[PDB]
Amino acid sequence: EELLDLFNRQVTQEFTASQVYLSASIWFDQNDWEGMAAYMLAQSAEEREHGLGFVDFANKRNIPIELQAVPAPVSCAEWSSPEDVWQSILELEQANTRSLLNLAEAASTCHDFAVMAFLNPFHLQQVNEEDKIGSILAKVTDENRTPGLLRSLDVVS
Amino acid sequence: EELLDLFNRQVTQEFTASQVYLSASIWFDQNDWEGMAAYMLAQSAEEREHGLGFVDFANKRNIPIELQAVPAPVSCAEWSSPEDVWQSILELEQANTRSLLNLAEAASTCHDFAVMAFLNPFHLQQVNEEDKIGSILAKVTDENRTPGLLRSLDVVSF
Amino acid sequence: EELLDLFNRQVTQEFTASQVYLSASIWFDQNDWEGMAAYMLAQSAEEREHGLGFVDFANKRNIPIELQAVPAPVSCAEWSSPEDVWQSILELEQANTRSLLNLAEAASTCHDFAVMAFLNPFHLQQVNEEDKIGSILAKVTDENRTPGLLRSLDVVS
Amino acid sequence: SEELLDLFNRQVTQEFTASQVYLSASIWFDQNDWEGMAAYMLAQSAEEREHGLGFVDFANKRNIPIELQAVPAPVSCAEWSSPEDVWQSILELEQANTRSLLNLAEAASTCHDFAVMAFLNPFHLQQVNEEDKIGSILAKVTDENRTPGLLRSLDVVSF
Amino acid sequence: EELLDLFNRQVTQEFTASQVYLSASIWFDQNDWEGMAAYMLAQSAEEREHGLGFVDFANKRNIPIELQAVPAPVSCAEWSSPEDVWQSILELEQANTRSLLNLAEAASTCHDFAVMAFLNPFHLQQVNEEDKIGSILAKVTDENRTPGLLRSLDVVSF
Ligand SMILES: [Fe+3]
Ligand SMILES: [Fe+3]
Ligand SMILES: [Fe+3]
Ligand SMILES: [Fe+3]
Ligand SMILES: [Fe+3]
Ligand SMILES: [Fe+3]
Ligand SMILES: [Fe+3]
Ligand SMILES: [Fe+3]
Ligand SMILES: [Fe+3]
Numbered sequence: 001e002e003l004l005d006l007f008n009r010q011v012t013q014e015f016t017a018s019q020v021y022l023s024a025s026i027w028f029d030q031n032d033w034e035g036m037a038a039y040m041l042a043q044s045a046e047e048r049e050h051g052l053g054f055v056d057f058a059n060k061r062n063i064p065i066e067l068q069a070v071p072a073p074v075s076c077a078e079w080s081s082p083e084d085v086w087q088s089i090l091e092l093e094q095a096n097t098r099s100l101l102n103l104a105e106a107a108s109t110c111h112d113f114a115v116m117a118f119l120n121p122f123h124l125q126q127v128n129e130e131d132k133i134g135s136i137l138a139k140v141t142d143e144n145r146t147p148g149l150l151r152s153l154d155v156v157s
Numbered sequence: 158e159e160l161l162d163l164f165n166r167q168v169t170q171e172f173t174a175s176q177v178y179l180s181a182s183i184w185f186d187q188n189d190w191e192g193m194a195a196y197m198l199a200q201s202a203e204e205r206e207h208g209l210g211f212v213d214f215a216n217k218r219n220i221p222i223e224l225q226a227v228p229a230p231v232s233c234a235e236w237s238s239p240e241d242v243w244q245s246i247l248e249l250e251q252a253n254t255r256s257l258l259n260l261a262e263a264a265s266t267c268h269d270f271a272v273m274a275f276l277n278p279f280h281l282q283q284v285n286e287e288d289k290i291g292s293i294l295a296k297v298t299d300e301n302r303t304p305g306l307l308r309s310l311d312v313v314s315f
Numbered sequence: 316e317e318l319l320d321l322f323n324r325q326v327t328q329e330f331t332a333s334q335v336y337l338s339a340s341i342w343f344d345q346n347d348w349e350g351m352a353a354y355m356l357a358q359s360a361e362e363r364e365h366g367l368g369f370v371d372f373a374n375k376r377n378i379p380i381e382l383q384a385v386p387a388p389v390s391c392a393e394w395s396s397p398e399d400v401w402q403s404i405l406e407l408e409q410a411n412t413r414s415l416l417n418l419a420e421a422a423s424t425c426h427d428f429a430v431m432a433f434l435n436p437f438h439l440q441q442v443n444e445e446d447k448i449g450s451i452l453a454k455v456t457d458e459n460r461t462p463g464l465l466r467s468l469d470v471v472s
Numbered sequence: 473s474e475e476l477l478d479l480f481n482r483q484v485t486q487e488f489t490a491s492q493v494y495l496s497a498s499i500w501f502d503q504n505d506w507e508g509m510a511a512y513m514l515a516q517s518a519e520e521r522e523h524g525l526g527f528v529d530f531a532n533k534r535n536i537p538i539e540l541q542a543v544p545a546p547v548s549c550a551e552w553s554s555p556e557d558v559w560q561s562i563l564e565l566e567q568a569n570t571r572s573l574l575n576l577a578e579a580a581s582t583c584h585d586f587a588v589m590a591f592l593n594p595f596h597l598q599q600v601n602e603e604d605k606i607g608s609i610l611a612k613v614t615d616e617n618r619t620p621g622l623l624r625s626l627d628v629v630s631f
Numbered sequence: 632e633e634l635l636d637l638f639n640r641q642v643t644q645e646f647t648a649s650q651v652y653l654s655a656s657i658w659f660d661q662n663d664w665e666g667m668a669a670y671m672l673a674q675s676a677e678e679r680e681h682g683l684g685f686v687d688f689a690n691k692r693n694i695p696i697e698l699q700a701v702p703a704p705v706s707c708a709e710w711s712s713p714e715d716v717w718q719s720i721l722e723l724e725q726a727n728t729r730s731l732l733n734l735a736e737a738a739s740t741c742h743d744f745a746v747m748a749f750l751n752p753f754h755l756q757q758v759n760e761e762d763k764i765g766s767i768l769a770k771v772t773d774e775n776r777t778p779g780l781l782r783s784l785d786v787v788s789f
Contacts, residue, residue, distance in 0.1 A: 015385075022370070023382055029374040032769040041367075048363070052356075055337070059344040060288040067338050070330075070385040113261045114284050117277040147776035152783050155770065295347040296470065302462035314470050375762040428735045429758050432751040453505040454628065460620035472628050 003106045003115070004063055007054070012068045013099045014051030018044050020092050023073035024085050033082060035154040040089070047096075050122070057118055083144060086137040093133050097126040160263040160272070161220055164211070169225045170256045171208030175201045177249050180230035181242050190239060190308075192315030197246075204253075207279070214275050240301055243294040250290050254283040318421045318430070319378055322369070327383045328414045329366030333359045335407050338388035339400050348397060350469035355404075365437070372433050398459060401452040408448050412441040473583045477536050479576045480527070480588070485541045486572045487524030491517045493565050496546035497558050506555060508631025513562075520569075523595070530591055556617055559610040566606050570599040634741050635694055637734045638685070643699040644730045645682030649675050651723050654704035655716050664713060666789030671720075678727075681753070688749050714775055717768045724764050728757040 021044035028037035058065045075088040100122050107115035144150045178201035185194035215222045232245040257279055264272035300307045336359035343352035373380045390403040415437055422430040458465040494517035501510035531538045548561040573595050580588040616623040652675035659668035689696045706719040731753050738746035774781045 019382060019385070026370060026374060026380055026382070032766040034766065055341060057284070059341060060284050065341055066391075067334060067341070067388050069387045070334070072384045073382050076381075111258070111262060111265070113258055113276070114280040117280045120277070148774035148780045149777065151770050151773045152780060152787075155784065155788050292347040292349065296466050299466045300463035303464065306463045306467075309467065310470065372758070376758050426732070426736060426739075428732060428750070429754040432754045435751070450505040450507065454624050457624045458621040461622065464621045467625065468628065
């Protein structure tokens, strides 16, 4: 099934996202943006929890899960400012949203009511997440127009 | 209307299931499996509560309900061991699930978004119920391989 | 620097172990061993925490970290009983122990006192972990000599 | 009362000897992953040492000279190959512990040593309880070990 | 013997560091950076506590201590901005780190396991201290690129 394979790929996408966020925390910590680093660490953990929630449902529903490699994050080689990092995180959340939507489309096709119900809170959370990351990126982009200004607002926490 | 008939039938199915669970409690109690009996009795009440939830929604949404007979459970006559009981209960939940999924299909066909929304927690509850029942059944089947060992699932656990 | 390369590989090893524990949880859950599944799930989280610890230390000490792929867990495909799973986990912990000891050796050669100090609690944790896993494996191997009896370990402990 | 003073001194040795045999049993059980039985033996080891300390305290107070002897190496641990073997040795140890205290009380009685006899009473009653408890466990172990793996239940649950 | 010398020098280095931090507080206070001043004063007290810890250990281990002069701080004659102060304090911690590592190599050579164990928490504290000072210096150097902005760090953090 399309639905089985896609359900597995969703697990992989959550854990990939978790590792991309961790990469982002490392870039931030290495460049002394400790606040932004903490934010990314927290998000890394929450994406892994999403992945675990998908594994749990799959196990219950007898959807076979085979854990795939979690690829090495690559965007961290090109980041040179906070803006770059937040833009890559926005793109990551857009891609997490598209993958949930593909999954839901396959479930809709299959008349898989339980899967569609399972996905609903993640659809709504993805709305919130893309909105939050978008908002931060807009703030970052504005503040960084003045030297030092952005730093003064990582310091928060 | 098909949606309406299937909504009525769903009430029947929940009450049917409640009675099959009661039947299972009886067989266990009669055979001194008081733990498994308690589990079945609790599930009997819960099934009945599901029925009642369907009745309440129906009443709100002006879906006419006419209570049907609650058929007599038939599988107890055959049961010989706890394995046979838990297997019949798994089959009952699998049928509870197919019934909900058919009602959801009818609702989808009719664009009845309210009914589809109302069913969603039931869809997810059935996933959990089939998993839990399947798990117990696997334990029962394994433990019963050694004489008397299953009598420790009951007394210890449950 | 061997030291810096080994410190990076230790992060990958912690995350690899996290994913192998998750694969153990899955096999247990799929096979209705919910007790053992939960044990594996918890140990998965803890191994990730260890990896996070090494990342944080590295950031503070200016050891550059580049996240590597976390390879797909392999042992899963061939597990057939709980004994097989627990045996693979013991072998993982034994490997986890050797990796830390090799890192410590490289640190000792370099006179890297800070890294040696950082590693001390992990050395002692591994002793505890290998002991605990070996002890569960011995119980599983003994109990599984009687059909169904091991299904008792799970339900109780 | 040279006999008495002697046997009292040696009773300290006997308690500490028993403490070490319990410790040995704890080690055998830990090394073989019976952590439940191991903990029980470790606790009994501490308690036998306390009994010895009680004998020493009483002797100091009653001007009975104490000279601490070597505590012999435990040797039953070489032969042990199952829990049954361990618990049988521990039963034998307690039965020996009881005989040693009765011989001490016999010597006190002969000497009209009312204080020592009073001091020993709670110990005579404790040994009754200890031999019963150990005998009961050994009976359980012996029965459960008739089915492979089943004794691992005793450990994991109880203890 | 060299361990004994290096262990006395370590006490000296901690007290010398204490005084340098005190100098940094004075410079900040005089220049109305009261937040940075209080941070430096806190670090001054803490470096003195570390020296006292070394003294206590030495007394216990019969390592004879003879207290050396605390030299007059001199970096404070040349500081013109907060960045210059923080840079000096980074160099200070880097030298405190070096002195601990020298001492640990000497204990290692002598197989002095007690000394090496005593040092372990200090090795890890120095990693944290250099990281923290490094991070503050990065923030100061960035924020000082806009006139007046660094006054924001002083009031907000610290
Ligand atoms: Fe996600
Ligand atoms: Fe996301
Ligand atoms: Fe139901
Ligand atoms: Fe680990
Ligand atoms: Fe581990
Ligand atoms: Fe005793
Ligand atoms: Fe005794
Ligand atoms: Fe210091
Ligand atoms: Fe310092």
